Amino acid sequence: MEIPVIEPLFTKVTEDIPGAEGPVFDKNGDFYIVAPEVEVNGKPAGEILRIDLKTGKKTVICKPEVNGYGGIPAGCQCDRDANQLFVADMRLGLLVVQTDGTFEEIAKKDSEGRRMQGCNDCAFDYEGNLWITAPAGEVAPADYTRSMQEKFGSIYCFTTDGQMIQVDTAFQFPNGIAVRHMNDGRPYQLIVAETPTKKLWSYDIKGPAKIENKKVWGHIPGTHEGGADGMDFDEDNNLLVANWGSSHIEVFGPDGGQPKMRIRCPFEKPSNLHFKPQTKTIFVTEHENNAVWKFEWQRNGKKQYCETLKFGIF
Ligand SMILES: [Ca+2]
Ligand SMILES: [Ca+2]
């Protein structure tokens, strides 16, 4: 159109990853994907994988389970001060996963003593606070439920002082999440995808675990089943959003509203995305083929928290 569409070349990265999700780079430049939808005898047995980018070969580093309840690991962020992954899990809540494949479950309950909800994606701000979507109901051992039909999805902030703070509720499948920063580094806006409603929501970030000014920020095209899944900013603060079911990744400008551009994918179900540091390359997971691809965007990604320095000067 208008809406202009681009059709970049998609190159295959790896294959056969059920529910391929949560692409992420660690501080060494290793690449990981999660496979939330792996099952064994009809019960969850989701996986965290390292991918060798040269070969496409997959290694399962972690198949998390707590007291026999398998995980549904769905979204990732790399930490800054240690090379460890924070993983949103639809059964287990928030996990911290080491490169050796060991892991810990961070919260059974929130800061107000409510049972934790299962999580789908997360985003660190540059202050080190982790903003998390929780579209599932209560974590294991509660019977699994998810908010695709009914409005019981929540949002959390897991703070630098270790508090798991519920910051909003009553979403119909909160999904992708991202933090916008001022040029100086200050976090100031939170964006949350609400998948089936075809909305992106915004909040002003007033401080750690302090959001206000909830607004319907962006509109996701289409009336397909699905909607916005994963998202990330480019270095100019354009927001790229996988629109699962639409065959496109949407591109929003800084001010939201309607997409300014769309990216056609050679598949119907883009799920999540991540830039390779220092490059224009976006890795994309998708659920038509349960596979991972890459393509070149117009500019580099916005640096993730793990690319910033605790002891930086500038
Ligand atoms: Ca997701
Ligand atoms: Ca990402």
Residue numbers in the entry: 1 to 314
Original paper wording:
The DFPase is a 35 kDa calcium-dependent enzyme that exhibits a six-bladed ß-propeller structure with two calcium ions in a central water-filled tunnel, similar to that of the mammalian recombinant paraoxonase-1. Blum et al. elicited the following mechanism based on a H218O isotope labeling experiment: the calcium-coordinated Asp_229 was identified as the nucleophile that attacks the phosphorus center of the substrate via the formation of a phosphoenzyme intermediate. Another possible catalytic mechanism for DFPase might involve the activation of a water molecule, as in PTEs, PLLs, human paraoxonase-1, and the lactonase from Staphylococcus aureus (drug resistance protein 35), a DFPase structural homologue.
After refinement, the R and Rfree factors of the DFPase X-ray model improved from 11.1 and 12.8% initially, down to 10.3 and 12.1%, respectively. Out of the 481 water molecules in the DFPase structure, the positions of hydrogen atoms of 20 water molecules could be established solely on account of electron density peaks. The small fraction of water molecules for which hydrogen atoms are visible interestingly comprise active site water molecules, thereby allowing us to construct unequivocally, the hydration shell and the water hydrogen-bond network in the DFPase central tunnel. The hydrogen bond network of water molecules is different in the X-N and X-ray structures, despite the similar localization of water oxygen atoms. In addition, the donor-acceptor (H…O) distances turn out to be shorter in the X-ray structure than in the X-N model. In the X-ray structure, a strong electron density peak (maximum contour: 4σ) is visible close to the equivalent water molecule (HOH_524), which can be unambiguously allocated to one of its hydrogen atom. Moreover, this electron density peak displays an elliptical shape, whereas all the other electron density peaks revealing water hydrogen atoms in the DFPase X-ray structure are spherical. (iii) The oxygen atom of HOH_524 is coordinated to the catalytic calcium (distance: 2.5 Å) and (iv) further interacts with the carboxylate side chain of Asp_229. Our investigation into the DFPase active site in the X-ray structure suggests that the calcium-coordinated water molecule HOH_524 is partially activated into a hydroxide ion through proton relocation towards the nearby Asp_229 Oδ2 atom.
